[model samples]
Target chain A: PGRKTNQLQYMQNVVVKTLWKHQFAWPFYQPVDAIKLNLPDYHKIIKNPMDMGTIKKRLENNYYWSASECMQDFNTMFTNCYIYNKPTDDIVLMAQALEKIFLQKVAQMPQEEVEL
Target chain B: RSLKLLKHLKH
Candidate 1:
């Protein structure tokens, strides 16, 4: 019956989720504007402009998730936790992209790709 | 059934 999270893990989760949602366009363009918002949980992951910047750098350089990779990593990230499902968005795919050339793979996947 | 670091990330 302690706090659900400690500081380190809490910050780490924030960092991870920040990187996860770094590619969102509104956060980049309107650094100070109060645009439309997602659910509270998504807001929790990416709250402020500086926070967005931190995650943006990581996503821009280190790790970006594609539809396939996002699906894979998401499944790998939450294998059996409360009915997880893959995303179907370009921003997320851009975030999941690893290399500049990774986008090419997106065009070549099977037409009958199974989505969950 | 603990959610360890990797496992927590996993599921």
Candidate 2:
């Protein structure tokens, strides 16, 4: 049968859609609200209502946090692990998030656990 | 896609 390569065509179509769609609207989109909830010292650092102005700007502009941005935010808070201060609620929350994210990533890719 | 897939796998 002179049938066309439907599978190949369909696969490319999916890939094209993935690339063409708004990345922020993709499966990995994490809203500013959710990110702020996850980020450590978010409330403490942003005491002023306008402190996280960039976040608001991004949200209004439909900008998204790429994995790198997430990693950077996580890393910045992670440094707090060295501080010899009492464990406050925000600190505790950050510890929990760090544990869960690291654990999940480690479980799936044990070979790169240390790297992650 | 991967996150949802992983969630289902874990469950």
Candidate 3:
């Protein structure tokens, strides 16, 4: 490959590797019921898994215990890899919110160049 | 404001 092609391949490969590493966490496709199974505390918090539209609103707005429950459920999903297989709207929003918080922390880190 | 400060930083 030419140098340009090599550069493009390198970028694509990095993206692929990044996605592979984050496969379990970001863009999570699993339903809320599945997540609740892994985090049973959710059973007490969520009245119904199927009504995620309203749940997402409450969770986003920090209503009731929704914020804590969302954070806890997200943590469980991130740490426990084998829980989710299919994508759901609720999980996607949760993942996006978590990603934003993570990126914010990353942005606050002191800058440094790599030795590699 | 913080938003204005943030916008200034971007510039």
Per lDDT, the best of the predicted structures is: 3
- Model 1 bad stretches (over 4 Å): A1-35, A43-52, A55-86, A98-116, B1-11
| Complex DockQ, candidate 1 | 0.02
Q: Which of the predicted structures, 1 or 2, would earn the higher DockQ when compared with the native?
A: 2
Model 3, position B8, has a per-residue lDDT of 32
Best candidate, DockQ-wise? Answer: 2
Note the clash tally of each candidate: 8, 0, 3
Ranking by TM-score: 2, 3, 1
TM-score of chain A of each: 0.22, 0.27, 0.26
Better of 1 and 3 by TM-score: 3
Q: How well is each residue in A4-107 modelled by candidate 1, as lDDT tens digits?
A: 22222322244344434534323222222223231234334433223334433433443433233333433332221122223643433443442222233333
TM-score of each prediction: 0.21, 0.25, 0.25
Candidate 3 regions exceeding 4 Å error are A1-85, A113-116, B1-11
Interface root-mean-square deviation, each candidate: 13.6, 13.0, 16.3
Q: lDDT (CA) for every model shown? A: 0.32, 0.32, 0.36
Using TM-score as the measure, the top candidate is 2
* Per-residue lDDT over A1-116 for candidate 3, one digit per residue giving the tens place of the 0 to 100 score: 11223222322233223333553332333344434244455446544333223323433343433223433443454433222322443444445555555445434433432211
- Model 2 pairs in collision: none
